[PDB]
């Protein structure tokens, strides 16, 4: 009493639990209660994760206030101390857990049948205590209360199949959701539910982390469960059940992996964004502990708002540097919000649909989307059209022989200085959900490859991917393309043709998957275009690198009176007001462009005979025209079968932008037009 | 009643269902299941399948039954047994082993056969389910998938030596020399704390005799995942497989295998001093079946695994190294080999989706067939591996031809030239993370032994990296003398290299050697140097454009856009049969034609070394092996000479100067 | 800064044959003697 003194805190957990139960049972504003609908789904085993919205709790409290009832601030209590309310809400859900309307069959998970077995076993042991005491003949309330004193049942955490998470309350619908930098998360925020805004830099493999290790004793037939809380644990050697503890001949008990409780465990590393780091500082990282069904929701390169419980961990640094009870910290992730939704996770829900129709019905989708790509960049409309086609990409074809065709458009922008090639690269990086901006001859030599290291979390050798690997199923914007090393150039060649990187080096023999669309920006030989010199002469690209690019723009800066007047009005308007000059044309928001492009990428248009015949004729005419000029000062490198597949890819991308399933003549017309005007700036 | 705790498995019901499945299954059930009812032939798909298998295993004395898991889906009564086996492999496989023993005993007794029942009863029969559901890769398995029957597919990189796993511990008394033999129980052996003899009860008298215990074989194999689905941004993964007591040494490095086994997790002790385990479990696979034969892949070269094949017979592992060729399949192979257009049929069957390149696909086919391997009784070795270089104008499908020969070959590694190193292509020293030791791992040229190594961008790889390929392309070996490794390693791998000339275009002004830009010592090692040129011909464009645009008419193309092409399933089996069973022998007329032609070629410009005669012979042998001929006539030598001449385009090359006459090119 | 991990058990299966000398068998037999002993049709020890 004198030691371990008691303190008077304003938190009463009994009525807080009562409020939690009332909210779970009665809240229905989002036909019946939302949360019992969710628990009914969980009981029937269609759902294994319970997400408790703090907006729902806040709305429930507001409604209780409006009707006059005084309700405790459950939202603030959860935000201040979130670890206890996961525990509380789990107990409350267990109390109000509906019976399953679907019977256990052979297609259910082994965990589900194990939980059903132990639930039935504990109810049977309750009934067996009851029958035995009734036979002993010594009110049913007292009989029951004796039974739960003399039963060793499976605790509710062992008969539990769902995972509980706390979704932060929205800023518009409002502490736990305002984004914090890694620096702004001090020790005052420890123990609270907080949201950190950052970029993920390293994700470990999903490993089974034991939470309650189970053992079976062959002597008494008991199952002894030992909870695990730390990095390491000491296994039990002798049984600790009632029978063996009371007896003198103890039983030696063996592990039961199938009966143990495991958690899907990941240890991600979030990092400060460049806009969050102070002046002259290096960004610092934070450890995120992802558990349960939330795993595989974070990947390196993701810019995310991660909401979780900021919790302390035992010290792991040097012992001589420990001054007091120093503790490491991590973020027990509860919710993940992706700034750039991936194209693979696209679903045609109602709101996604309404937005897409409001984009289509406005008309001129192709030109609106192209002109909306970097709208302060002015007068590069064919450039923006080609970039939009690169974002959409063609249709990947796997022939039955096992052959694969790339399906992705590589675009090279060779141009004069000050033409916005680098500004167009960052625009594409911003638009793309998986976009990697690199500069040649910087530090990307290992970037255009993967490096083998050791995972600190899990004792394995894993090769972490670089620029060409992190931008997988995305876009790699390579600036200063003409200034890379030979190894990097060969890697780019392999990526642009086979979409793989074959590495055979000391310690590694692998074929990395790099399904990357390459957007290169280059400067012409001598840094400025010499129209006196041949185009191929001024292009410092091997006929084989040039061949790989589906489109090669020649962005030349020729002086003029009207064109320069119009660029200067645009740039000066952008400098006054942080927006583009045109009032008739409104740019598409980059989030709504990503949603349209995600929708468009789900279509796989095919080519009919009537369109592919023209495609063949155009290819023949292109080949003849290329043959007629091999060195006529306008030679772009003669046409190749790669130009046919680039024409095909551009036509398929244009068909996808129309949300069509037929590759029409208009799309092939526009593809040929884009290829032709890729090179008219020379004239 | 009486199901097993923690499982849905009931011993009686599962045994009855599996016995009914074994006694009453016909392959027409699976043919109906796979929606292939029009392939159903009454002769072999209407016999009890597993009754015949049990009879064959009884006659042959084997102990392992290879159960196709998908077969359980065909039978109605075992639709649940499939899920039980996948979910609970341990209990279900034990019940299946018992049921196999009962089934064979019933087959012997009920049919009143002569076979002795003593050696059947004392034999341990095992079941090897392989074709379980193939999905989820390896990294997408959650902790709920622990102790489940999973199916991985990948490449074998390394294998530890045979580890002894103690099954019976033999103790001995330090006083009275009395011995008990304790049995292992879930990895724990109960050491006696007292001599069980009533005469002496000394407490710590008993000592473990390590060399008199009973041990079993355990082996850990390092595998690289090659999943069907690869999520964006991830890199290739490596896992550890555990093979036990008959599957040890059944997988060699460089093997592409599909392995079915139990997904297990073990706690790893943090330190060797104290007994404290790590809360983060380590995952691995207990191998129960290994499949080394793919129906869309050539069989492994039996000339390289003869010792391994006969060691497999002593080991009674019953691992199918080479696919089975039935009598009907052999008759079909002979009928196809009797065709008049066999050469052009096999050539156009190679990569059907690549446009017409008849000589490139005819050289590729001959390389796949290979020459004749001649071992000297007095000491020596000639290997029929054919090395082919594809130098040519950019965009000619050279890389698609390397990607097909990589996919179709049994073993081989696809390299990119600049991404390869001299150490990388040979054996190197790495560090294991499990044992924390230094181990040897094979290179690309060693993992490709017995197959084809595909090297793209052969020009971009440096001079010193190219030095290691000399010994491989000539002696088919790598004689390595480095710190920790001094030995000769077999590297009997054909080399399929691809390259473009300097300037990335074949300039007709420069001679052939200037364009290829390879040292005479390496350009001689190539048995076939192809100059693939992109000429502008209107009909060539017309037809290459129809070919490419026909692949886009349907979302997943079924390519039959030829007169007739053999399926890869038939093509690989034909090539494997010809390689295994046909060994052409040079005849005297072939010898005279060979000498004639070599002297004719032996008369700047590309040189003709003595190695060209050796490319002739083996090429001729390859042709003689293609037609299933056991002898080489002068027609095969003439075909080899014609292929050699047409590959380098001698018909358009001036003898005095190595210019290619662009008007003389025969693209067609 | 974490709490104390708990250890708990639950009966699932019949273990090894109850042996007569086991403290838990002895306790069970004493409990049966207390609850079931009758003297002149009276549970003397239960009532006491």
């Amino acid at each position: 009493s004198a030691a371990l003194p008691s303190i008077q805190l304003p938190v009463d957990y009994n009525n807080l639990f009562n409020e939690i139960t009332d909210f779970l049972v009665t809240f229905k504003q989002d036909k019946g209660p939302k949360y019992m609908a969710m628990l009914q789904k969980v009981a029937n085993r269609e759902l294994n994760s319970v997400i408790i919205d703090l907006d729902d709790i806040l709305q429930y409290q507001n409604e209780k206030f409006l009707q006059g009832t005084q309700a405790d601030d459950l939202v603030s209590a959860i935000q201040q101390n979130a670890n206890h309310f996961t525990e509380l809400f789990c107990r409350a859900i267990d109390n109000n857990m509906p019976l399953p309307t679907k019977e256990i069959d052979y297609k259910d998970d082994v965990l589900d049948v194990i939980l059903n077995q132990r639930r039935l076993r504990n109810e049977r042991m309750l009934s067996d205590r009851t029958n035995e005491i009734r036979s002993e003949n010594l009110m049913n309330d007292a009989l029951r209360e004796v039974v739960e004193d003399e039963t060793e049942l499976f605790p509710p955490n062992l008969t539990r199949r769902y995972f509980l998470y706390f979704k932060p309350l929205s800023q518009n619908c409002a502490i736990s959701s305002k984004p914090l930098s890694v620096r702004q998360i001090k020790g005052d925020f420890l123990g609270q539910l907080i949201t950190v805004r950052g970029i993920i830099t390293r994700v470990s493999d999903v490993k089974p982390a034991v939470e309650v290790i189970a053992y079976t004793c062959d002597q008494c037939g008991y199952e002894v469960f030992q909870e695990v809380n730390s990095r390491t644990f000491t296994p039990l050697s002798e049984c600790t059940s009632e029978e063996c503890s009371q007896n003198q001949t103890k039983g030696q008990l063996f592990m039961s992996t199938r009966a143990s409780k495991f958690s899907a465990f990941q240890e991600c590393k979030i990092q400060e964004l460049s806009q969050q780091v102070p002046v002259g500082h290096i960004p610092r990282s934070l450890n995120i502990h992802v558990n349960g069904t939330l795993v595989r929701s974070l990947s390196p390169g993701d810019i995310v708002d991660v909401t979780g419980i900021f919790l302390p961990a035992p010290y792991t640094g040097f012992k001589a540097l420990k001054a007091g009870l120093l503790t490491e910290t991590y973020l027990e992730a509860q919710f993940v919000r992706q700034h750039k939704k991936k194209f693979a996770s696209f679903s045609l829900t109602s709101d996604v649909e309404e937005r897409v129709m409001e984009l289509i019905t406005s008309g001129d989708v192709y030109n609106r989307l192209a002109k909306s790509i970097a709208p302060e960049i002015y007068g590069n409309l064919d450039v923006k059209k080609a970039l939009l086609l690169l974002l959409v990409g063609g249709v990947d074809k796997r022939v039955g022989d096992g052959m694969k065709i790339r399906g992705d458009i590589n675009v090279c922008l060779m141009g004069d200085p000050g033409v916005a090639k680098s500004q167009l690269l960052k625009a594409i990086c911003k638009i793309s959900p998986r976009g990697v901006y690199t500069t040649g001859k910087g530090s990307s030599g290992v970037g255009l490859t993967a490096a083998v290291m050791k995972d600190p979390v899990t004792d394995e050798m894993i090769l972490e991917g670089g620029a060409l690997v992190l931008a997988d199923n995305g876009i790699c914007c390579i600036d200063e393309f003409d200034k890379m090393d030979e190894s990097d150039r060969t890697a780019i060649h392999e990526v642009m043709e086979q979409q793989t990187i074959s590495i055979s080096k000391a310690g590694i023999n692998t074929t990395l998957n790099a399904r990357t669309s390459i957007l290169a920006a280059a400067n012409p030989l001598y840094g400025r275009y010499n129209p006196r010199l041949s185009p191929l002469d001024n292009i410092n690209l091997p006929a084989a690198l040039l061949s790989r690019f589906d489109i090669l723009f020649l962005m030349l800066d020729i002086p003029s009176r009207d064109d320069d007047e119009k660029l200067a009005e645009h740039v000066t308007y952008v400098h006054m007001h942080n927006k583009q000059p045109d009032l008739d044309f409104t740019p598409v928001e980059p989030s709504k462009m990503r949603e349209y492009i995600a929708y468009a990428k789900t279509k796989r248009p095919v080519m009919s005979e009537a369109v592919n015949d023209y495609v063949v004729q155009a290819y023949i005419r292109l080949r003849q025209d290329s043959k007629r000029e091999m060195d006529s000062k306008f030679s772009f490198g003669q046409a190749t079968p790669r130009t046919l597949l680039g024409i095909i890819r551009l036509s398929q991308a244009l068909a996808k932008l129309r949300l069509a399933d037929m590759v029409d003549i208009d799309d092939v017309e526009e593809a040929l037009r884009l290829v032709r005007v890729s090179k008219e700036s020379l004239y | 009643l009486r199901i097993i705790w923690g499982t849905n498995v009931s011993i009686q019901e599962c045994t009855t269902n599996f016995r009914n499945f074994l006694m009453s299954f016909k392959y027409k059930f699976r043919k109906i299941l796979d929606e292939r009812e029009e392939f159903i032939n009454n002769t072999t798909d209407e016999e009890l399948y597993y009754i015949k298998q049990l009879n064959e295993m009884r006659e042959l004395g084997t102990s392992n039954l290879n159960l196709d898991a998908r077969n359980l889906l065909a039978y109605k009564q075992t639709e649940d047994l499939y899920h039980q086996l996948l979910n609970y492999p341990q209990e279900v496989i034990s019940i299946m082993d018992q049921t196999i023993k009962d089934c064979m005993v019933s087959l012997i007794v009920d049919n009143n056969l002569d076979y002795d029942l003593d050696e059947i009863e004392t034999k341990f029969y095992k079941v090897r389910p392989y074709n379980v559901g193939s999905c989820k890769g390896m990294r997408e398995l959650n902790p709920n998938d622990i102790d489940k029957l999973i199916n991985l597919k990948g490449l074998v990189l390394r294998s530890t030596p045979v580890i002894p796993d103690m099954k019976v511990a033999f103790f001995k008394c330090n006083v009275c020399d009395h011995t008990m033999a304790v049995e292992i129980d879930r990895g724990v052996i109960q050491e006696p704390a007292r001599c069980e003899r009533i005469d002496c009860n000394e407490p710590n008298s008993m000592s473990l005799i390590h060399n008199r215990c009973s041990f079993a074989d355990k082996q850990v194999i390092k595998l690289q995942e090659t999943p069907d689905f690869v999520p964006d941004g991830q890199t290739p993964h490596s896992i550890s497989l555990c093979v036990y007591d008959e599957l040890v040494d059944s997988c060699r490095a460089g093997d592409r295998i599909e392995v079915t086994g139990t997904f297990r997790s073990i706690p790893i002790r943090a330190n060797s001093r104290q007994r404290v385990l790590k809360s983060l479990y380590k995952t691995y696979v207990d191998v129960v079946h290994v499949k080394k034969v793919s129906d869309k892949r050539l069989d492994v070269d039996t000339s390289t695994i003869e010792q391994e094949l006969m060691q497999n017979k002593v080991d009674h592992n019953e691992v199918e190294e080479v696919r089975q060729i039935t009598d009907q399949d052999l008759a079909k192979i002979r009928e196809v080999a009797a065709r008049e257009d066999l050469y052009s049929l096999l050539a156009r069957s190679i990569a059907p989706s690549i446009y017409e390149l008849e000589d490139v696909k005819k050289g590729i086919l001959l390389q796949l067939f290979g020459g004749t391997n001649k071992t000297f009784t007095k000491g020596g070795r000639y290997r029929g591996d054919i090395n082919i270089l594809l130098c040519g104008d950019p965009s000619t499908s050279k890389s698609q031809i390397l990607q097909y020969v990589h996919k179709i070959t049994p073993r081989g590694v696809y390299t990119s030239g600049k991404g390869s190193s001299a150490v990388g292509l040979t054996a190197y020293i790495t560090r294991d993370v499990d044992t924390k030791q230094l181990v040897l791992e094979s290179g690309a040229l060693v993992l490709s032994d017995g197959g084809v190594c595909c090297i793209d961008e052969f020009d971009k790889m440096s001079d010193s990296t190219r030095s290691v390929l000399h010994e491989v392309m000539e002696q088919q070996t790598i004689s390595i003398a480095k710190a920790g490794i001094i030995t000769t390693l077999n590297a009997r791998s054909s080399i399929l290299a691809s390259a473009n000339p300097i300037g990335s275009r074949y300039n007709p002004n420069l001679p052939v050697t200037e364009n290829i830009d390879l040292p005479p010592p390496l350009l001689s090692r190539f048995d076939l140097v192809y100059l693939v040129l992109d000429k502008v011909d209107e009909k060539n464009d017309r037809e290459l454009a129809k070919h490419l645009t026909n692949l886009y008419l349907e979302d997943k193309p079924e390519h039959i856009s030829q007169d007739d092409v053999l399926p890869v399933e038939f093509l690989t089996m034909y090539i494997s049969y010809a390689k295994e069973h046909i060994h052409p022998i040079i005849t005297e007329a072939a010898k005279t034609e060979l000498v004639r032609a070599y002297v004719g070629m032996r008369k700047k410009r590309i040189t003709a070394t003595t190695r060209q005669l050796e490319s002739m012979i083996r090429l001729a042998e390859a042709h003689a092996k293609m037609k299933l001929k056991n002898v080489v006539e002068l027609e095969d030598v003439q075909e080899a000479v014609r292929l050699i001449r047409s590959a380098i385009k001698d018909y358009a090359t001036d003898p005095k100067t190595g210019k290619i006459d662009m008007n003389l090119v025969q693209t067609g | 800064s974490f709490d104390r991990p708990e250890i708990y058990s639950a009966p699932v299966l019949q273990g090894e044959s109850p042996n007569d000398d086991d403290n838990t068998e002895i306790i069970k037999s004493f409990k049966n003697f207390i609850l079931e002993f009758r003297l002149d049709s009276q549970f003397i020890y239960r009532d006491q």
């Binding site: 052979y106 049948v113 059903n116 076993r121 062959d218 | 009643l1 199901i3 | 299966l13």
Partner: peptide, 30 residues
């Protein structure tokens, strides 16, 4: 029931005998 029975082997494997200890009634599971 019918009057006949399948011909079962006499030798029981150690694993099959070990599985006999883990049996529970079908009221649990299926």
């Amino acid at each position: 029931g019918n009057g006949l029975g399948p011909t079962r082997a006499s030798v029981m494997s150690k694993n099959m005998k070990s599985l006999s200890r883990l049996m529970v009634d079908r009221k649990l599971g299926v």
